[PDB]
Amino acid sequence: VETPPEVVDFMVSLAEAPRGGRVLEPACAHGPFLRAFREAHGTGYRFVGVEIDPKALDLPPWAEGILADFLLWEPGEAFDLILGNPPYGIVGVFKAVKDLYKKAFSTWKGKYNLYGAFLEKAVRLLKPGGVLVFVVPATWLVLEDFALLREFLAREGKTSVYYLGEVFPQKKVSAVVIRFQKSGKGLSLWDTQESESGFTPILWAEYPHWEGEIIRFETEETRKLEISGMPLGDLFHIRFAARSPEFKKHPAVRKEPGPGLVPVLTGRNLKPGWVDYEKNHSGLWMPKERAKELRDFYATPHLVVAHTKGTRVVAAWDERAYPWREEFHLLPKEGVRLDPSTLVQWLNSEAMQKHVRTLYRDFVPHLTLRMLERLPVRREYGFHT
Numbered sequence: 001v002e003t004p005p006e007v008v009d010f011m012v013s014l015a016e017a018p019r020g021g022r023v024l025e026p027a028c029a030h031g032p033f034l035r036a037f038r039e040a041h042g043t044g045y046r047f048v049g050v051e052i053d054p055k056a057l058d059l060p061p062w063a064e065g066i067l068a069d070f071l072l073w074e075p076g077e078a079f080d081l082i083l084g085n086p087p088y089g090i091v092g093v094f095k096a097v098k099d100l101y102k103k104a105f106s107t108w109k110g111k112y113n114l115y116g117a118f119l120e121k122a123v124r125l126l127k128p129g130g131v132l133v134f135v136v137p138a139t140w141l142v143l144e145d146f147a148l149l150r151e152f153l154a155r156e157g158k159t160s161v162y163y164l165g166e167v168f169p170q171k172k173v174s175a176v177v178i179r180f181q182k183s184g185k186g187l188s189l190w191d192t193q194e195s196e197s198g199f200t201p202i203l204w205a206e207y208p209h210w211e212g213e214i215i216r217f218e219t220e221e222t223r224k225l226e227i228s229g230m231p232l233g234d235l236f237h238i239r240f241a242a243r244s245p246e247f248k249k250h251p252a253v254r255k256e257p258g259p260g261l262v263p264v265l266t267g268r269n270l271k272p273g274w275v276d277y278e279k280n281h282s283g284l285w286m287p288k289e290r291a292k293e294l295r296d297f298y299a300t301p302h303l304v305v306a307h308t309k310g311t312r313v314v315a316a317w318d319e320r321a322y323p324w325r326e327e328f329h330l331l332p333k334e335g336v337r338l339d340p341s342t343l344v345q346w347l348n349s350e351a352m353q354k355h356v357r358t359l360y361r362d363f364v365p366h367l368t369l370r371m372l373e374r375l376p377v378r379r380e381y382g383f384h385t
């Protein structure tokens, strides 16, 4: 929260409304965007603010305050411009309300997130040609739970995404400003440069036929690398480890070492290019040959790629086939032949790190399945014929 001034200024500069138009700020509180817009564009507008907490609603006399749950409020009028910084979070009573939300919002998938709902509601309250400018996390660009939100936006209007990054005081959230015009078109991806005067936009690329696919920062080098290799997801089955509880509810699993016992490995045992079979980080041990009973692949030496180490590719070949409590487990597909040592070297390479960092920056904190499935494998490390 607490939208930094330079961010509010940037958003206000992308905003527009016809003289007399209705300007709305959902989850307004004291109305930071209502005020800023008026100061920058003028008084000739109808300013409206919606707040649910009667103790937060602190608006000037020129603004029409409204106490309601934006997500469930049904006004009788559409709006020209919607400005705001929607609440970031899940389920906030809670589960009770959540179900009404789940039935009210069509883009709601998985645990979703409140900001996605605000976006859909906002678009639905917009009149044709209307404009919304929101600051939100960058997770919806790549995450699976936001696939429906992406399709929605793509089909309802033209979308512009301005990458800001980690601009808020709390540093682990990457922000993005979305400028949506309810006048169908495609997607424009912009980057920004932070200077003393604030942000300066820089057009990165445009996708006029965008229909909701993941948004990435592509360059000629990424494109090149991807067309000249095959997707890792065509050569391997990506499997998931058993969660810690499965192990604890499994007999033969001890919480103290002993002879014949092997440590249940975690992401701390995975190093770039090697596995540390020595240090136990889970506090669980079990007879190696018994791991096969939790997941069959535990008995097969295979490739392990990290999902806990952030947005980078850390991989190793588990030659010993130990039980794992996490990470991605890759099993080659039928007929795929590969060179483990060179594949591993390739995945941990600088070029691979540069490639991934270029595309997804810091949108999300960990490498996801969708990012992993598309990693290009040079045909000289593995192939299916």
Ligand SMILES: C[S@@+](CC[C@H](N)C(=O)[O-])C[C@H]1O[C@@H](n2cnc3c(N)ncnc32)[C@H](O)[C@@H]1O
Pocket: 001, 002, 003, 026, 027, 028, 029, 030, 031, 032, 033, 050, 051, 052, 053, 056, 068, 069, 070, 071, 084, 085, 086, 087, 088
């Ligand atoms: C992200 S804050 C934005 C505050 C302020 N506009 C700013 O930019 O700093 C969302 C505010 O709207 C209110 N709010 C939270 N959940 C809401 C909901 N479901 N419906 C309506 N208002 C909500 C809260 O009081 C909260 O202060």
